[PDB]
Amino acid sequence: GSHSMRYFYTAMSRPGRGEPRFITVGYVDDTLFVRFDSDATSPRKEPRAPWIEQEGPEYWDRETQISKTNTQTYRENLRTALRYYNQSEAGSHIIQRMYGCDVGPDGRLLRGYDQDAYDGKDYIALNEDLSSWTAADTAAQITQRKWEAARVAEQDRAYLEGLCVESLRRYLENGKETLQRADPPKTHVTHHPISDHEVTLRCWALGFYPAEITLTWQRDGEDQTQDTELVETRPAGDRTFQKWAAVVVPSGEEQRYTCHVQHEGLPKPLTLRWEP
Amino acid sequence: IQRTPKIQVYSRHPAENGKSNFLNCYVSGFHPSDIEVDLLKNGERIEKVEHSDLSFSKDWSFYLLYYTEFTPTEKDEYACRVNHVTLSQPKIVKWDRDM
Amino acid sequence: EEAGAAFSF
DSSP states (O other), rough: OEEEEEEEEEOOTTTTTOEEEEEEEETTTTTEEEEEEETSSSOOOOOGGGTTTOOOOHHHHHHHHHHHHHHHHHHHHHHHHHHHOOOTTTTTEEEEEEEEEEOOOTSEEEEEEEEEEETTTTEEEOOSSSSEEEEHHHHHHHHHHHHHHHHHHHHHHHHHIIIIIHHHHHHHTTTTTHOOOOOOEEEEEEEEEEEEEEEEEEEEEEEESOOOOOEEEEETEEEEEHHHHHOEEOOOOOOOEEEEEEEEEEEEEESEEEEEEOOOSSOEEEEOOOOO | OOBBBEEEEEESSSOOSOOOEEEEEEEEESSSSSEEEEETTTTTTTTEEEEEEOOOOOOOOOEEEEEEOOOOSSOOOEEEEEEOOSSSOEEEEEETTTT | OOSOOOOOO
């Protein structure tokens, strides 16, 4: 399959309750592999997957340092967003960063990211070309100016194209047994009468990895997008995910409906009905 | 500025009376990050509940998993109690094995 | 592996 590696920063100011909290999580696809949290008793990069444990002592010291430096920078950043947006020092604010790389099956770059958000709205994003920025407003334009001035996009591209893809390839190899295994969903259709004359068919998918899945109800072979109730894909706790789609159908009509399952662990897309 | 959590309460494995299992509360699509989550057993707060580390979706909205060891029985009613700045009053979402 | 130290806003 295709793969990705992402790092997600969250920096959260908390006036009156100490210095902003800085949190870093690193994911290969939908597996968390590494974490850093400035509130930990001893703030350090910590392994969250077995296959990253086999990284040497230097790795952890280098990676912790990056994260301790970033803690400061991202705290510098919140103070800056305060000036740039003429806000007061009494409110709690959030800066987030997602950056990383997608690789094709062959293992080379498909796309790279480096974007930030301030209080849950877009601030600045590295464009697909990895040499230009999209600033969201006049505040983030100041950052853009600064970032062009100091050849940042260029450094991202050297990373996104070199280290990102190379470490991602080493990770997928060391964690081959899990990272390159797709677990198919276990599927069944449940039948819950509601009125005398209306029933709930719910299509389940359980125990699948990765998270990406398509679940669709059809009536006489037609999409029922607007009659279908769809829950967000949810983690089980054992690395796997769950999802359901549901339709409310009239009684005696359960056989006009079919559930459609698409997922990367399945050779064929599944068609399933309600069975007695 | 602010986004309200979505709440799902469900078991790690299909529910079966007298078999130990994990109880989950997945709060997601929310912003700001601060959030209070309790798992309830017949009303009373379950101690020593664990959560995942904070992350967020493509849209920048956070998501967390809270979870506890549990053995479902007939009588034992289970829920999740969630509070967030977007909520005037804490929100209780009940466990329903077939959901 | 992470990129080196991130840059100021």
